[PDB]
Write a protein that binds this ligand. Structure first.
Ligand SMILES: OC[C@H]1O[C@@](CO)(O[C@H]2O[C@H](CO)[C@@H](O)[C@H](O)[C@H]2O)[C@@H](O)[C@@H]1O
Length: 263
């Protein structure tokens, strides 16, 4: 059976032609609202949260790790390098790389975080260490975005990503300074205006990370502080049947607007 929330999300999905996955956690009472919440979806750049968090975890026992400069060579650049291109033949610290990955969705920056963690499997291992049994990172940028229907590579479920984002930002999967740093980064994201944020009441504070990829995959994950009530975590994943489908950030905004009703 469905609730009216789920029915609205199903109708949005039907109209969009694609496949929508939603998970809301309301931390007032730790209830969840799910739509396809246990189905896998391609994460695309939403995986950058796990990678940044994994580096923050490393920094809990190496307090200057975040300030460590990393060389950016010409050959490091991939398909979308808005920050890293400014530093070719220079450096970016792991903090600068995290900020670029999270706040600009820089793919070179993500590949440096992945390298810091020893490869995609290092990101997955961090996920398992914080109780995320679902996340898997298989590939680097840009191939982690191929988003092929049903392919389990580089996927998670909405429920698992919401539980993890709660643990990382409101819980204590990270140390105190590190959790605050992740929240600061997410809150300052520059790429999210058309996605979840566009569907929320404007008085609400939010941190988010978007993703996009082939098959018109359009994603966003957010930690949200509504005005006068306990925070929320919201995941909205969306993917489409044809490889060259257009982005649909508006679907995410719509999903958020549905979920916000009654909150
Ligand atoms: O940023 C370079 C760094 O990224 C990794 C992946 O974490 O490799 C990616 O970038 C290379 C150079 O652009 C690509 O050849 C490679 O296929 C891609 O995965 C690291 O291996 C590398 O140190």
């Amino acid at each position: 059976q469905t609730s009216a929330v789920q029915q609205k999300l199903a109708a949005l999905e039907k109209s969009s032609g694609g496949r929508l996955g939603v998970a809301l956690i309301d931390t007032a009472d730790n209830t969840q609202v799910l739509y396809r919440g246990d189905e896998r979806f391609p994460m695309c750049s939403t995986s950058k949260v796990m990678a940044a968090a994994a580096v923050l975890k490393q920094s809990e026992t190496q307090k200057q790790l975040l300030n460590q400069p990393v060389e950016i060579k010409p050959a490091d650049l991939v398909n979308y390098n808005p920050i890293a291109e400014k530093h070719v033949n220079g450096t970016m610290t792991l903090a600068e790389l995290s900020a670029a990955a999270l706040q600009y969705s820089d793919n070179t920056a993500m590949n440096k975080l992945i390298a810091q963690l020893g490869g995609p499997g290092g990101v997955t291992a961090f996920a398992r260490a914080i109780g995320d049994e679902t996340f898997r990172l298989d590939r680097t940028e840009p191939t982690l975005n191929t988003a092929i229907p049903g392919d389990p590579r580089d996927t998670t479920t909405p429920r698992a990503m919401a539980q993890t984002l709660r643990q990382l930002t409101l819980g204590h999967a990270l140390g105190e300074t590190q959790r605050a740093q992740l929240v600061t980064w997410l809150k300052g994201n520059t790429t999210g205006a058309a996605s979840i944020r566009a569907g929320l009441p404007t008085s609400w504070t939010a941190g988010d990370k978007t993703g996009s990829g082939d098959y018109g995959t359009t994603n966003d994950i957010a930690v949200i502080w509504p005005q006068g009530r306990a925070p929320l975590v919201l995941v909205t994943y969306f993917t489409q049947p044809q490889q060259n489908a257009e982005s649909r950030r508006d679907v995410l905004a719509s999903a958020a607007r549905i979920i916000a009703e009654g909150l």
